[PDB]
Design a binder for these strands. Structure first.
Ligand SMILES: [Zn+2]
Length: 184
DNA sequence: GCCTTGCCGGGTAAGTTCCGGCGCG
DNA sequence: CGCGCCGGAACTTACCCGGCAAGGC
């Protein structure tokens, strides 16, 4: 179902970029499974991310609630759900097998979470070099030149720099086809 | 002349894992 | 009894930001 794979990919990019997949073991022997996306902007979390997550949930017949917790520095979209946790964890394990629909959606996701949002330059930051190397090939096989290097020597944070040469192709094909490549 | 890109410190917006509670068969 | 949802919240740091300078045509 192409539908959901795409939105799943996009959300997985947000999770990986701005959240987490958590398997907690409480004393009990209780457990919990969390799919998490955090972000400072209440409006982005309630009006764009939560509707997408809701759709996905409704469609996978997941009965958990979309929690939205107001932490001090951050809003936290949280779904407590074993089904949804593995849905994403398994999808992450098979990330190399993504198809062109998902890759674009995954990159858009990853970018909205981890990207340069001024769009003056096109940069994506992450400590997981392997993840970036994967995004790099998808970008290469899509006509978008890019390089990876260590940007933050202090915290081991790599950057994937997208060439301003392929600027338009990137913004127009991957971020959003209604977004103008060269910002104010 | 203009553009692109690697560097690198600032400091915040993310991330991670505790807790106490309740529900399910 | 043995697990899985809920609602938080403390605590840590991984991003992002943005200026600078080398270098490419
Ligand atoms: Zn972010």
């Amino acid at each position: 179902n192409e539908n959901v794979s795409g939105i799943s990919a996009y959300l997985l990019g947000l999770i990986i970029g701005d959240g987490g997949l958590y398997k907690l073991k409480y004393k009990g022997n209780r457990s919990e499974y969390r799919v998490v996306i955090t972000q400072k902007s209440e409006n982005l979390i309630k009006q764009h991310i939560a509707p997408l997550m809701q759709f996905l949930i409704d469609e996978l017949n997941v009965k958990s609630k979309i929690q939205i917790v107001k932490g001090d520095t951050r809003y936290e979209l949280r779904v407590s759900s074993k089904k949804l946790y593995y849905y994403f964890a398994n999808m992450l394990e098979r990330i190399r097998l993504f198809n062109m629909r998902e890759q674009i959606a995954f990159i858009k996701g990853l970018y909205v979470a981890e990207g340069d949002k001024t769009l003056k330059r096109l940069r994506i930051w992450n400590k997981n070099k392997a993840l970036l190397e994967i995004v790099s090939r998808w970008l290469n096989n899509l006509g978008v030149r890019n390089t990876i290097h260590l940007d933050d020597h202090r915290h081991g944070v790599y950057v994937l720099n997208i060439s301003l040469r392929d600027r338009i192709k990137f913004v127009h094909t991957i971020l959003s086809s209604h977004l103008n490549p060269l910002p104010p």
